[PDB]
Motif scaffolding. Structure first.
Motif, mmCIF file in Angstrom:
data_model
loop_
_atom_site.group_PDB
_atom_site.id
_atom_site.type_symbol
_atom_site.label_atom_id
_atom_site.label_comp_id
_atom_site.label_asym_id
_atom_site.label_seq_id
_atom_site.Cartn_x
_atom_site.Cartn_y
_atom_site.Cartn_z
ATOM 1 N N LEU A 51 -22.129 -68.993 6.691
ATOM 2 C CA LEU A 51 -22.506 -69.761 7.873
ATOM 3 C C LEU A 51 -21.284 -70.270 8.627
ATOM 4 O O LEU A 51 -21.238 -70.211 9.860
ATOM 5 C CB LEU A 51 -23.411 -70.922 7.468
ATOM 6 N N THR A 52 -20.281 -70.773 7.907
ATOM 7 C CA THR A 52 -19.122 -71.358 8.567
ATOM 8 C C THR A 52 -18.251 -70.315 9.253
ATOM 9 O O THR A 52 -17.517 -70.657 10.183
ATOM 10 C CB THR A 52 -18.293 -72.159 7.565
ATOM 11 N N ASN A 53 -18.304 -69.066 8.810
ATOM 12 C CA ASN A 53 -17.580 -67.981 9.457
ATOM 13 C C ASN A 53 -18.244 -66.652 9.124
ATOM 14 O O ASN A 53 -18.043 -66.123 8.026
ATOM 15 C CB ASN A 53 -16.116 -67.976 9.022
ATOM 16 N N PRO A 54 -19.067 -66.100 10.017
ATOM 17 C CA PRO A 54 -19.676 -64.789 9.738
ATOM 18 C C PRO A 54 -18.671 -63.660 9.593
ATOM 19 O O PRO A 54 -18.937 -62.709 8.850
ATOM 20 C CB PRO A 54 -20.610 -64.581 10.935
ATOM 21 N N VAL A 88 -28.469 -38.199 16.435
ATOM 22 C CA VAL A 88 -27.304 -37.324 16.347
ATOM 23 C C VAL A 88 -27.340 -36.515 15.058
ATOM 24 O O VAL A 88 -27.075 -35.308 15.059
ATOM 25 C CB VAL A 88 -26.007 -38.145 16.462
ATOM 26 N N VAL A 89 -27.664 -37.166 13.939
ATOM 27 C CA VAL A 89 -27.714 -36.468 12.660
ATOM 28 C C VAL A 89 -28.827 -35.428 12.659
ATOM 29 O O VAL A 89 -28.654 -34.316 12.148
ATOM 30 C CB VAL A 89 -27.870 -37.476 11.508
ATOM 31 N N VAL A 139 -14.841 -76.507 8.477
ATOM 32 C CA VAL A 139 -15.143 -76.546 9.901
ATOM 33 C C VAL A 139 -15.836 -75.243 10.266
ATOM 34 O O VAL A 139 -15.342 -74.157 9.949
ATOM 35 C CB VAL A 139 -13.870 -76.753 10.739
ATOM 36 N N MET A 140 -16.993 -75.348 10.909
ATOM 37 C CA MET A 140 -17.749 -74.169 11.287
ATOM 38 C C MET A 140 -17.131 -73.498 12.510
ATOM 39 O O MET A 140 -16.390 -74.111 13.282
ATOM 40 C CB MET A 140 -19.205 -74.535 11.570
ATOM 41 N N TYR A 141 -17.452 -72.216 12.682
ATOM 42 C CA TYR A 141 -16.987 -71.466 13.841
ATOM 43 C C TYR A 141 -17.675 -71.890 15.132
ATOM 44 O O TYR A 141 -17.263 -71.449 16.208
ATOM 45 C CB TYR A 141 -17.192 -69.967 13.612
ATOM 46 N N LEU A 166 -27.703 -32.431 14.758
ATOM 47 C CA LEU A 166 -26.679 -31.675 14.047
ATOM 48 C C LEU A 166 -27.271 -30.921 12.863
ATOM 49 O O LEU A 166 -26.876 -29.784 12.585
ATOM 50 C CB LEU A 166 -25.563 -32.610 13.586
ATOM 51 N N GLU A 225 -23.819 -38.179 6.231
ATOM 52 C CA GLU A 225 -25.168 -37.975 6.739
ATOM 53 C C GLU A 225 -25.313 -36.503 7.101
ATOM 54 O O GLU A 225 -24.526 -35.976 7.894
ATOM 55 C CB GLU A 225 -25.446 -38.856 7.955
ATOM 56 N N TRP A 273 -29.083 -48.742 12.500
ATOM 57 C CA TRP A 273 -28.408 -47.451 12.539
ATOM 58 C C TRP A 273 -28.697 -46.757 13.864
ATOM 59 O O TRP A 273 -29.857 -46.610 14.258
ATOM 60 C CB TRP A 273 -28.863 -46.588 11.364
ATOM 61 N N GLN A 288 -20.626 -35.702 20.568
ATOM 62 C CA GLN A 288 -21.325 -36.662 19.727
ATOM 63 C C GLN A 288 -21.134 -36.312 18.256
ATOM 64 O O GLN A 288 -21.313 -35.161 17.854
ATOM 65 C CB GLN A 288 -22.812 -36.689 20.071
ATOM 66 N N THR A 289 -20.764 -37.306 17.464
ATOM 67 C CA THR A 289 -20.624 -37.210 16.021
ATOM 68 C C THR A 289 -21.430 -38.334 15.391
ATOM 69 O O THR A 289 -21.812 -39.290 16.074
ATOM 70 C CB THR A 289 -19.154 -37.307 15.580
ATOM 71 N N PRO A 290 -21.736 -38.239 14.093
ATOM 72 C CA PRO A 290 -22.441 -39.346 13.428
ATOM 73 C C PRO A 290 -21.645 -40.640 13.367
ATOM 74 O O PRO A 290 -22.212 -41.671 12.988
ATOM 75 C CB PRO A 290 -22.714 -38.794 12.024
ATOM 76 N N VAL A 291 -20.363 -40.626 13.720
ATOM 77 C CA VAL A 291 -19.544 -41.829 13.721
ATOM 78 C C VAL A 291 -19.061 -42.178 15.128
ATOM 79 O O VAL A 291 -18.082 -42.892 15.288
ATOM 80 C CB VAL A 291 -18.363 -41.697 12.742
ATOM 81 N N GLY A 292 -19.738 -41.678 16.152
ATOM 82 C CA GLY A 292 -19.416 -42.003 17.528
ATOM 83 C C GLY A 292 -18.794 -40.827 18.260
ATOM 84 O O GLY A 292 -18.581 -39.746 17.709
ATOM 85 N N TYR A 332 -27.340 -43.602 14.917
ATOM 86 C CA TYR A 332 -27.017 -42.182 14.961
ATOM 87 C C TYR A 332 -28.088 -41.322 14.298
ATOM 88 O O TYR A 332 -27.805 -40.211 13.847
ATOM 89 C CB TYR A 332 -25.656 -41.930 14.319
#
Ligand code: A1IWA
Ligand code: K
Ligand code: K
Ligand code: K
Ligand code: K
Ligand code: K
Ligand code: K
Ligand code: K
Ligand code: K
Ligand code: MG
Ligand code: MG
Ligand code: MG
Ligand code: MG
Ligand code: MG
Ligand code: MG
Ligand code: MG
Ligand code: MG
Ligand code: MG
Ligand code: MG
Ligand code: MG
Ligand code: MG
Ligand code: MG
Ligand code: MG
Ligand code: MG
Ligand code: MG
Ligand code: MG
Ligand code: MG
Ligand code: MG
Ligand code: MG
Ligand code: MG
Ligand code: MG
Ligand code: MG
Ligand code: MG
Ligand code: MG
Ligand code: MG
Ligand code: MG
Ligand code: MG
Ligand code: MG
Ligand code: MG
Ligand code: MG
Ligand code: MG
Ligand code: MG
Ligand code: MG
Ligand code: MG
Ligand code: MG
Ligand code: MG
Ligand code: MG
Ligand code: MG
Ligand code: MG
Ligand code: MG
Ligand code: MG
Ligand code: MG
Ligand code: MG
Ligand code: MG
Ligand code: MG
Ligand code: MG
Ligand code: MG
Ligand code: MG
Ligand code: MG
Ligand code: MG
Ligand code: MG
Ligand code: MG
Ligand code: MG
Ligand code: MG
Ligand code: MG
Ligand code: MG
Ligand code: MG
Ligand code: MG
Ligand code: MG
Ligand code: MG
Ligand code: MG
Ligand code: MG
Ligand code: MG
Ligand code: MG
Ligand code: MG
Ligand code: MG
Ligand code: MG
Ligand code: MG
Ligand code: MG
Ligand code: MG
Ligand code: MG
Ligand code: MG
Ligand code: MG
Ligand code: MG
Ligand code: MG
Ligand code: MG
Ligand code: MG
Ligand code: MG
Ligand code: MG
Ligand code: MG
Ligand code: MG
Ligand code: MG
Ligand code: MG
Ligand code: MG
Ligand code: MG
Ligand code: MG
Ligand code: MG
Ligand code: MG
Ligand code: MG
Ligand code: MG
Ligand code: MG
Ligand code: MG
Ligand code: MG
Ligand code: NA
Ligand code: NA
Ligand code: NA
Ligand code: NA
Ligand code: NA
Ligand code: NA
Ligand code: NA
Ligand code: NA
Lengths: 221, 404
Positions: free
Chosen positions: A80-83, A170-171, B264-266, A174, A123, A165, B93-97, A167
């Motif tokens: 919570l304090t830092n995601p 895309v998968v 201290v929170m963000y 392909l 994938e 997700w 286009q690829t599965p990772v962008g 992609y």
RNA sequence: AUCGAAUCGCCACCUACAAGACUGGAGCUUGCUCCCUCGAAGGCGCCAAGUAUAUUCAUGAUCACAAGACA
RNA sequence: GUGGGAUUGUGAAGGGAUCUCGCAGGUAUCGUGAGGGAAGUAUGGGGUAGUACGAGAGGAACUCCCAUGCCGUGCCUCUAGUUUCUGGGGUUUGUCGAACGGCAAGUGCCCCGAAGCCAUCGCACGGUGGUUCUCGGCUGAACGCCUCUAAGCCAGAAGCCAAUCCCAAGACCAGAUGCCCACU
RNA sequence: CGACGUCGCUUUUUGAUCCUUCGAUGUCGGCUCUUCCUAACCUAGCGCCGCAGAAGACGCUAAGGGUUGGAUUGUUCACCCACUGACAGGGAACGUGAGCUGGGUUUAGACCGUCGUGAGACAGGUUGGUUUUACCCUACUUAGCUGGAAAUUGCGAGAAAAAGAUUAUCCGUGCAAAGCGGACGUCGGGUCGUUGGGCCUGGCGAGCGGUGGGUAGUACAUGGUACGCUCAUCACC
RNA sequence: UUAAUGAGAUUCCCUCUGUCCCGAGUUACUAUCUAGCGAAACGACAGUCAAGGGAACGGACUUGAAGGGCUAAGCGGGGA
RNA sequence: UUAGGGAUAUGUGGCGUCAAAACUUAUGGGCUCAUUCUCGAUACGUGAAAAGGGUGUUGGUGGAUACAGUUGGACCAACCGAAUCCACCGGCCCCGAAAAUGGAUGACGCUUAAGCCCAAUUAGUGAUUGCCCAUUAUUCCUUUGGUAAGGGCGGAAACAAAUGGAGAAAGUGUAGCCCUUCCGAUGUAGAUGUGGCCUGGAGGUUAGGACGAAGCUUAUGGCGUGAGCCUAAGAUGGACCGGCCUCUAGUGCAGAUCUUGGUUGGCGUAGCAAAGAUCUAACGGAGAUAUACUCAACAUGCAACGUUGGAUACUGGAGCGGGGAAGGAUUUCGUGCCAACGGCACUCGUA
RNA sequence: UCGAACCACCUAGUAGCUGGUUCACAUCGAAGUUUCCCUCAGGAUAGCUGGUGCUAGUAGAAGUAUUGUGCGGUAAAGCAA
RNA sequence: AAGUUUGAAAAGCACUUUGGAAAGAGAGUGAAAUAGAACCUGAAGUCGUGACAAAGACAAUGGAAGUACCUCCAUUUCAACGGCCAGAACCAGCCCUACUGCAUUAUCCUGUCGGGGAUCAAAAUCCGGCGGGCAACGAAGUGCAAGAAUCUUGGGUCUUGG
């Protein structure tokens, strides 16, 4: 990843040929997620190099909604304090499998990270793995021997697409192109396959007779 | 225990971290959704902020109290000299962008484009693109370009052009930078083969802003805001000031967190960098796409006000100078100070609103001095008020008698 | 070019696909009968390029990381 | 192999040995986007309409249109605020013999005052698709009938997820490119 | 909605206890600021009613968003005036004092009532009564440098790449097809190891080109690039 | 009871205002950077979190989640 | 339930991964589906749950009907051709079931379970130990101590080197007189023992040191279960001192907000910000115009002093004016000087 | 320095209270209970423990059975005693 | 608070060179300047430097086992010699596994008759009468087993010692 110029220079000085480590390629389609991860985790700890493909076709028991809610409960857990530097929730099916294997390893030791770094997940089946050799399966983690077929099950890619997700299309595109290309190649090379079949059948009449009897005794003719 | 009274939190947590922007230029993080049924077109353009003024126009929207009545609207003037297309890039286009397939460079590149590759261009060897020029047009060079272009046809789903600004044509004394600003402009519309055809036809050619945008359309602005350095929580986040009685200072947040969590929170306002953040701003209506003053001098002349005026106000735009090129008049304001390069992007939000669909007709454009309460629209108007001055008599008397 | 290394299965026949409530093919009687390629083998590789007329192996002396390895 | 250094503390100049380190990368652009953040939210008016409903008394809503509150991100054309541009004028006491020029009163004081900064005290802008809840249904058994369900489907909440937006490769990008160099 | 009974939940009340702290964990309230819960006041949907309409009651999913200005009181509570779609209830060491404030509480001065012979006492009233320290470590906010995949080493070799004398032995086109279309030559030398052999190199040409000389029109936003012709030079070679 | 007096306690009205709505701008000296000079307090060891148990409120322990290293200016959540 | 070790078996708990063991055992039987604290896998630990309810599924008990019951057809009887329906009691699952940082069958995950109940050990085959983990059990080796148990101890005889050996103490305790045998061994407060260790001195005895005593230094090794002892080296030192028996005492340190001395991170940090202020040239001074190459100067000697002349400003007569008391006592004056001091500096000074 | 100044001394005042208390190994190894005490944060006093032993080394043994022979009024039961 | 405790002797560092000086670099005295004037010895702690070891973030330290590299350490061995390493033989002792007999079945095994059952018709599951009996294949998973691992050359002992 990309080789250094020193590494390339040393190889040329050594005059060595192309090298590939002994890598097992597992087709994860219709494999139970937990049972496949436990088997793969033990093999990684035994020094095996493993590459898994088609992670989007893994299976989890239960309805898709039940498993989607299970992921959404995991997603809501964050510092919570830092995601940032909080729990990192990966949405891709290959990363989901990698996380499942990681929780089944001693990830906070050097030996555990050596095992984890020996696993590569994909994938679908990417081009660099298509022609590397025959794929293997895990018989004790396969869906048709693990689940009673009446019970509903989810496909990992379908669950992942609805929790972040991006992609999935895309998968699928392909994978469709890969199967058509592999089918066209397999539709060809049929003549070569039948040519060797007739060569083995015709060779029985050319070999010495006593060698044929030995083959018949051990069920090869 | 719960807070005694409720009020909304200060600031937007989605604009974090409030750090300095990585680049000074505005860059579109995303482009409008590609639709294959339209003809290929460019989706962005780079401009320079000159200054601000205000206009007068009639409002057309029915049902309003200002329907068929005049309103006064502040506008921003942005200088838009033509852009040069120097390259083509394709993405698969690829599965990772998206991954870049390759780059097709133009056969000739401008000097100001090659200056971007140097920290000290004048004292360098200036060898940029020298080997690429020799390799291109050869037997192997022509084949490599054809192979890359065929790879775009086969594997690319996104086609973008590499464009750069012309600081020689801008001719601005205060801009300072002589190396062109380089950006990628996505080619939307048509098939991938059609996109490559337009990109090839634009290589080494100039592109004007009026071929990318239309007069009454809206556009998005990608720009970096004005920087303020380190600022306190009162200015950085808009928190309340503490009472005058407060020991050790007033411009602070009183409680920066509860006992637990022991952190201290963000989400707590803290002092730090303010300004110089990249912002994508939506739905800026174009009010005029002006032509260069060398081509058409009456830039600020309308059908209702027949005075022959340019867009440049009396005495010039403060800290910028004269608008000497084509320009875009955007309604309202845009992030960033004068002289800063900005990106105009084709809109990504739906444009079906009555306000967004309205046809804009300007009736009056103010060109009075932006220095100290301008009361004259033109220099001739000022001359008619004052008539001859003492310095006019001296200049005339010397010319009339000594020279004649 | 230090550099001596640990690793010991190759392939251009596996390296395509899908289903285990039924995927070799038929019939009607629907669980039996009939046809077939008979439904339980990826192919090679393991010392003569092939099953025979053959041919250098030592003293590296009885184990020792195979003292060698581009199949 | 080659290049560069060194060794353990009572001397000097020379020879060996043995160790450590370098031996291919630099520099400049354009992009990818995993992960993380994440935001818009309400009211009124017009019209519907004195209509539906109702004996009467009373009396609604959605499409659409126009404003507004709060919140958010900016901006400085206008208006307002701010002046150590002590800018230009005034004006008091002292002071350089006077005038001029000024000066001192830690910016003497007064009026006006550009630029810059700045105010919901001014101005601009604030978007798209899915998955589901609850629930209403379709087909339909179990249970000859019946039944939203039990196998299947449809529709669907300001929730939730993604797009848009912000940071972004310790996410180690075999993403793409410009120049040298190294290898060849 | 629910008497007589009965079964629970909660820890926003008090009580019970005395485990922690008495070589000290700063006490009430308010101000400020953030976050969390839901037993849901408003906002989104949806059921049901003693549901005609309007206004409402009850209930379900849902905590994303919102939940005010004032008089009296130190007050928390309370009460009243007013606005509003509404003015819901709570936790976070009864959140929050090296953040503030210090009105109350609870030192020493002093007054009153009651009590006490008295000194004095009073969860009775009253007035006046020092609020200290961060430059350390984390956390947070911004701001720089910087190596690293055996997360510093191993030489420990895995590409979301190509597709072949084992990636060598050319370039396109096509489906990992069927095919089809292209390719600078020639004359010598040196130097290493089965076929018009690999590599290095020289002389004549040709072609595609990079720069500069001389020249003509044209394009583009109009000083500055490109393009035709022709010379010189360099490169592939 | 009481005129006058009071740095005494209290209530209301006029005036007045940055007390507030709701903050904004400017100045001197700081902070900040440099030259010279140069301390103290404090200091078991140390220093990322969640939950769990535990002397019933952990920086160390269990199980998970994070965590590349070194730095400048701040800041007051924790270091009971 | 515990001397220091090895091997073999177990206990409790387990055998999908984390994590050793069924590389997910069987040729065992059943039951269970649980949508935002997310079915269950919690002995102790209530260390999470009730009353009540379910036409979820799976079992029982007792009744009723059978050409039935449900439909279609004419509030009752007929077509239609099979097993129904009435009450009650279990198992598992579900609802009842709402709290505050994000989180917990330990985590992942598991549903032909890796869940629950039961039952096995390679399975209707041929008989009665599947496997994994202890400071436990058995056994082997070594130590140590006993309420310890026994043997030997009158040198049997023979035997030079150059080329079988050594020892054999009548003994509490030592390097234990030697050998064999058996049993025990953890422990706060506390008791006791030790031919147990260490320090300064004394009476004795026996040694060492200028060819190097004490002290000090150590990746100097050896010995001892340990306290410690001893050797080696010093590219340390320069004059005293070791062993053994007995005697003796101001005799052993990690902590007492311990004492004294020194050091130390913080740290080149906090800061050195009231009293408005200095500028310029020249002179003086070591305090500069301070330089490998290149190189005209800047970009490579900075910053700081005293005096004098100018400039500017302050004190503004209740003065950083001129004299005295108290207090101080040479601070007065000239010359010289700059180690310390004047919290920066000084060539200046109340040094 | 003041609800009894300062200096030296009696004075190292007393403290059932707080803090500290310096080598090794070996054989053994507890108690927080009884009674009395101006006793309740402390003592004496038995008990538990160590040391030293003495006495003819099975003797006058036993946190255990069996068999005889005594004691009992809690669990249960009863209210038709 | 403070040992003036330099050295046997002051022989207390002439002279050269850089520096304004303090001092440095040389050169001298002395057995020894690391004995140079608050000067014998010169510890600990802390710090500088050179060399090397590496090392993410697990605060560091620690325990147990190995390994890589180093070692100004110790000891042993260097000829059919070794007190070093390794492998096979044999012995004795342990620890393991293989090879099994005695007893017992009857609510049982069979044939046949009758009944009953379900079939197109049977058979079987099932109940009675009678007659025989050993379910005997590795019969049974039922009670107890003592079977010299020499016969008939099992395994381990880097878990013992030779
Ligand atoms: C009067 C009264 C009641 O209110 C309080 C308020 C504070 C305290 C102090 C204690 N709090 C915890 C610790 O035991 C103590 O901390 C310290 C610093 O002493 C006691 C009572
Ligand atoms: K995201
Ligand atoms: K989120
Ligand atoms: K990277
Ligand atoms: K206390
Ligand atoms: K509602
Ligand atoms: K009182
Ligand atoms: K002893
Ligand atoms: K001290
Ligand atoms: Mg199946
Ligand atoms: Mg609230
Ligand atoms: Mg509050
Ligand atoms: Mg509060
Ligand atoms: Mg104050
Ligand atoms: Mg104060
Ligand atoms: Mg202006
Ligand atoms: Mg003056
Ligand atoms: Mg003004
Ligand atoms: Mg309570
Ligand atoms: Mg208490
Ligand atoms: Mg305190
Ligand atoms: Mg304390
Ligand atoms: Mg505190
Ligand atoms: Mg609710
Ligand atoms: Mg809500
Ligand atoms: Mg919220
Ligand atoms: Mg509190
Ligand atoms: Mg509470
Ligand atoms: Mg305070
Ligand atoms: Mg307070
Ligand atoms: Mg505080
Ligand atoms: Mg007070
Ligand atoms: Mg009285
Ligand atoms: Mg008071
Ligand atoms: Mg008082
Ligand atoms: Mg007062
Ligand atoms: Mg590496
Ligand atoms: Mg914690
Ligand atoms: Mg703090
Ligand atoms: Mg502070
Ligand atoms: Mg043992
Ligand atoms: Mg074992
Ligand atoms: Mg295991
Ligand atoms: Mg199983
Ligand atoms: Mg439990
Ligand atoms: Mg547990
Ligand atoms: Mg329980
Ligand atoms: Mg119940
Ligand atoms: Mg039920
Ligand atoms: Mg039931
Ligand atoms: Mg039932
Ligand atoms: Mg869980
Ligand atoms: Mg559970
Ligand atoms: Mg568990
Ligand atoms: Mg013993
Ligand atoms: Mg004799
Ligand atoms: Mg003796
Ligand atoms: Mg003991
Ligand atoms: Mg003494
Ligand atoms: Mg002696
Ligand atoms: Mg040493
Ligand atoms: Mg050491
Ligand atoms: Mg001694
Ligand atoms: Mg003493
Ligand atoms: Mg000491
Ligand atoms: Mg102390
Ligand atoms: Mg220091
Ligand atoms: Mg400072
Ligand atoms: Mg100060
Ligand atoms: Mg001053
Ligand atoms: Mg002067
Ligand atoms: Mg100079
Ligand atoms: Mg100078
Ligand atoms: Mg004055
Ligand atoms: Mg004055
Ligand atoms: Mg006067
Ligand atoms: Mg005076
Ligand atoms: Mg004097
Ligand atoms: Mg000084
Ligand atoms: Mg006094
Ligand atoms: Mg006491
Ligand atoms: Mg004590
Ligand atoms: Mg004992
Ligand atoms: Mg008591
Ligand atoms: Mg006591
Ligand atoms: Mg006590
Ligand atoms: Mg009773
Ligand atoms: Mg009775
Ligand atoms: Mg009775
Ligand atoms: Mg001499
Ligand atoms: Mg010495
Ligand atoms: Mg000496
Ligand atoms: Mg000395
Ligand atoms: Mg020292
Ligand atoms: Mg050192
Ligand atoms: Mg640690
Ligand atoms: Mg080691
Ligand atoms: Mg019979
Ligand atoms: Mg018979
Ligand atoms: Mg058996
Ligand atoms: Mg036998
Ligand atoms: Mg044996
Ligand atoms: Mg042996
Ligand atoms: Na103004
Ligand atoms: Na008074
Ligand atoms: Na702590
Ligand atoms: Na931990
Ligand atoms: Na089972
Ligand atoms: Na003994
Ligand atoms: Na200062
Ligand atoms: Na019969």
């Amino acid at each position: 990843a990309f080789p250094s110029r020193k590494d390339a220079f040393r190889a040329q000085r050594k005059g060595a040929k192309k090298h590939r480590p002994e890598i097992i390629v597992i087709d994860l389609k219709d494999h139970v997620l937990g049972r496949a991860a436990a088997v793969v985790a033990k093999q990684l700890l035994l020094g095996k190099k493993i590459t898994v493909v088609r992670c989007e076709q893994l299976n989890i028991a239960g309805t898709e909604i039940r498993n989607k809610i299970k992921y959404l409960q995991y997603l809501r857990k964050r510092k919570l304090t830092n995601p940032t530097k909080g729990p990192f929730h990966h949405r891709a099916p290959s990363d989901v499998f990698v996380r499942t294997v990681r929780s089944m390893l001693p990830r906070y030791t050097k030996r555990g990270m050596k095992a984890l770094n020996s696993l590569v997940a994909y994938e679908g089946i990417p081009p660099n793995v298509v022609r590397t050799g025959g794929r293997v399966v895990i018989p004790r983690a396969q869906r048709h021997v693990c689940y009673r077929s009446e019970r509903p099950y989810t496909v990992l890619g379908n669950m992942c697409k609805h929790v972040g997700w991006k992609y999935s299309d895309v998968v699928a595109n392909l994978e469709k192109a890969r199967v058509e290309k592999a089918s066209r190649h397999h539709e060809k090379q049929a003549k070569l396959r039948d040519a060797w079949k007739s060569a083995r059948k015709e060779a029985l009449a050319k070999m010495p007779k006593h060698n044929v009897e030995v083959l018949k005794k051990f069920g090869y003719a | 225990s719960h807070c005694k009274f409720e009020h909304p939190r200060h600031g937007h947590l989605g604009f974090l971290p409030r750090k300095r922007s990585r680049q000074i230029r505005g860059r579109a993080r995303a482009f409008p959704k590609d639709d294959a049924t339209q003809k290929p077109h460019l989706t962005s353009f780079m401009v320079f902020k000159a200054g601000m003024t205000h206009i007068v126009r009639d409002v057309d929207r029915p049902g309003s109290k200002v329907n068929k009545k005049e309103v006064v609207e502040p506008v921003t003037i942005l200088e838009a000299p033509p852009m040069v297309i120097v390259g083509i890039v394709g993405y698969r286009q690829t599965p990772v962008g998206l991954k870049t397939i390759g780059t097709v460079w133009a056969h000739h590149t401008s000097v100001e484009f090659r200056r971007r590759y140097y920290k000290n261009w004048k004292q360098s060897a200036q060898l940029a693109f020298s080997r690429q020029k020799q390799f291109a047009n050869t037997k192997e060079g022509k084949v490599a370009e054809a192979r890359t272009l065929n790879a775009f046809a086969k594997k690319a789903s996104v086609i973008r052009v590499i464009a750069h600004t012309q600081l020689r044509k801008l001719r601005n004394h205060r801009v300072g930078v002589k190396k062109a600003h380089v950006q990628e402009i996505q080619v939307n519309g048509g098939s991938v083969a059609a996109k490559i055809a337009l990109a090839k036809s634009l290589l080494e050619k100039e592109v004007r802003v009026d071929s990318v945008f239309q007069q009454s359309e809206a556009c998005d602005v990608c720009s970096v805001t004005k920087g303020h350095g380190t600022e306190g929580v009162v200015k950085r986040w808009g928190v309340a000031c503490l009472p005058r009685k407060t020991h050790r200072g007033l411009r602070k947040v009183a409680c920066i967190g509860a006992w637990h969590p022991a952190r201290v929170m963000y989400t707590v306002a803290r002092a730090g960098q303010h300004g110089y953040h990249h912002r994508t701003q939506l739905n800026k209506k174009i009010y005029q796409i002006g032509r260069s003053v060398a081509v058409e001098p009456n830039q600020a002349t309308t059908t209702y006000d027949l005075t022959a005026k340019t867009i440049t106000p009396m005495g010039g735009f403060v800290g910028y100078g004269t608008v000497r090129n084509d320009y875009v008049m955007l309604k309202g304001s845009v992030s960033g100070p004068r002289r800063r390069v900005m990106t105009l992007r084709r809109p990504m939000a739906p444009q079906t609103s009555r306000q967004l669909k309205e046809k804009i007709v300007l009736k009056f454009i103010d060109t009075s001095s932006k220095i100290g309460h301008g009361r004259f629209q033109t220099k001739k108007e000022k001359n008619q008020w004052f008539g001859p001055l003492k310095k006019d008599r001296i200049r005339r008397e010397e010319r009339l008698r000594k020279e004649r």
